[PDB]
Each structure stands twice: as C-alpha cells, then as structure tokens.
Amino acid sequence: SMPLQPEAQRALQQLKQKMVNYIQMKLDLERETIELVHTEPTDVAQLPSRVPRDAARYHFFLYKHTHEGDPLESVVFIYSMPGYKCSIKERMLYSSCKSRLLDSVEQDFHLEIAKKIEIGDGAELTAEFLDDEVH
C-alpha cells in the first residue's frame, strides 16, 4: 504494498530533518493506502495519549534522550494493536502492511529506525520502557 499518501510522505521527510517529533499513520482500507493521521508535537510524557484504545495505528517517535552521557535522538517505530477492540481482519491487515511500511520508510525514505516496538496499550510507553527497548 500500500503506497504512502503524499502527506504521509511529507511527514517522514520532516521527521528526517527533525521538524516534527511524532507521526501517526493508519491504513486507508477504501483506497488501500497509508494515510497520515497527524504530526502533533509530542513529548515522551504525552506519548501514551497518542495510542488509540479502539483502533490499530503506526507511530514514529523521535526519542530524545541520553545514553551514558552521549545525548541521542532516536526514531522509534511503534505498532499499536489494542487486540480487545480490533477485528481479526484489522489485526491481520495492520500486521501484514507493517513489514511493507517499514521497508518503504527505510528503503524509499532513508529513515534510520533505532527500534521497532509492538504494544497493545499506550500506557506501556513510559520513559523506562523506551530506554529498555532502545538500549
């Protein structure tokens, strides 16, 4: 595959220049494309609020942190799947496109992903969790 809508493409271009720090994407199942939801400014503390309870989402997050006195800004990919609230078709479609989306982001948009994470609940996305996953 499903191609990125141009707005989604532009969001990735911005993320690469660190002009945004957060991107939310979803599948547009009518056109079979990847659609930008938003790129609202998001600190680590607000990150859990970006994860819907009722629909699967893709997220890219610029995690600005320090690893052993060396400050870093790492792009974290998060696939969120609230199993209790998504249909088996939705789960399957988001899982299947996940691999394809990441191929394009790395291969066609030249974005370095420090870590790929799968969650079911935004509440999992603490600073402690992000630290442990990235490092």
Short mmCIF file of N, CA and C in Angstrom, two decimals, residues 1-6 26-36 58 93-94 97 100-101, unseen atoms left out:
data_model
loop_
_atom_site.label_atom_id
_atom_site.label_comp_id
_atom_site.label_asym_id
_atom_site.label_seq_id
_atom_site.Cartn_x
_atom_site.Cartn_y
_atom_site.Cartn_z
CA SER A 1 2.43 -2.77 -1.00
C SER A 1 1.44 -1.60 -1.13
N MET A 2 0.87 -1.17 0.00
CA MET A 2 0.00 0.00 0.00
C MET A 2 0.91 1.23 0.00
N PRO A 3 0.76 2.09 -1.01
CA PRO A 3 1.65 3.27 -1.04
C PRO A 3 1.29 4.30 0.04
N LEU A 4 2.30 5.07 0.44
CA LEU A 4 2.11 6.25 1.32
C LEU A 4 1.47 7.41 0.58
N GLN A 5 0.40 7.96 1.17
CA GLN A 5 -0.23 9.18 0.65
C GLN A 5 0.82 10.29 0.73
N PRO A 6 0.80 11.24 -0.22
CA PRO A 6 1.84 12.29 -0.15
C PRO A 6 2.00 13.02 1.21
N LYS A 26 -2.26 5.50 9.64
CA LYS A 26 -3.25 4.45 9.67
C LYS A 26 -3.47 3.93 8.26
N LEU A 27 -4.12 2.80 8.15
CA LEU A 27 -4.43 2.25 6.86
C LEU A 27 -5.73 2.84 6.37
N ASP A 28 -5.72 3.27 5.13
CA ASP A 28 -6.94 3.63 4.46
C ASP A 28 -7.36 2.42 3.62
N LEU A 29 -8.32 1.67 4.16
CA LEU A 29 -8.71 0.42 3.54
C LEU A 29 -9.63 0.57 2.33
N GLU A 30 -10.19 1.76 2.13
CA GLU A 30 -11.00 2.04 0.95
C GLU A 30 -10.13 2.19 -0.30
N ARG A 31 -9.05 2.96 -0.19
CA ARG A 31 -8.14 3.25 -1.34
C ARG A 31 -6.93 2.29 -1.30
N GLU A 32 -6.74 1.58 -0.18
CA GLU A 32 -5.56 0.73 0.05
C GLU A 32 -4.27 1.56 0.03
N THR A 33 -4.25 2.61 0.88
CA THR A 33 -3.09 3.47 1.00
C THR A 33 -2.82 3.70 2.50
N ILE A 34 -1.63 4.20 2.77
CA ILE A 34 -1.20 4.57 4.11
C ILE A 34 -1.43 6.07 4.27
N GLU A 35 -2.21 6.43 5.28
CA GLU A 35 -2.72 7.75 5.48
C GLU A 35 -2.09 8.41 6.73
N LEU A 36 -1.71 9.68 6.62
CA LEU A 36 -1.27 10.45 7.76
C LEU A 36 -2.45 10.81 8.68
N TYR A 58 0.07 3.02 13.35
CA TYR A 58 1.53 3.11 13.25
C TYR A 58 2.00 4.47 13.79
N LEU A 93 -4.44 -7.09 8.71
CA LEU A 93 -4.06 -6.11 7.69
C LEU A 93 -2.94 -5.20 8.20
N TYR A 94 -3.08 -4.74 9.43
CA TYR A 94 -2.05 -3.88 10.01
C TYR A 94 -0.72 -4.63 10.21
N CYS A 97 0.82 -5.20 6.57
CA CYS A 97 1.38 -3.99 5.99
C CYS A 97 2.58 -3.46 6.79
N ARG A 100 5.79 -4.00 5.22
CA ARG A 100 5.86 -3.27 3.96
C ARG A 100 6.09 -1.76 4.18
N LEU A 101 5.37 -1.19 5.14
CA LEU A 101 5.58 0.20 5.52
C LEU A 101 7.07 0.45 5.89
#
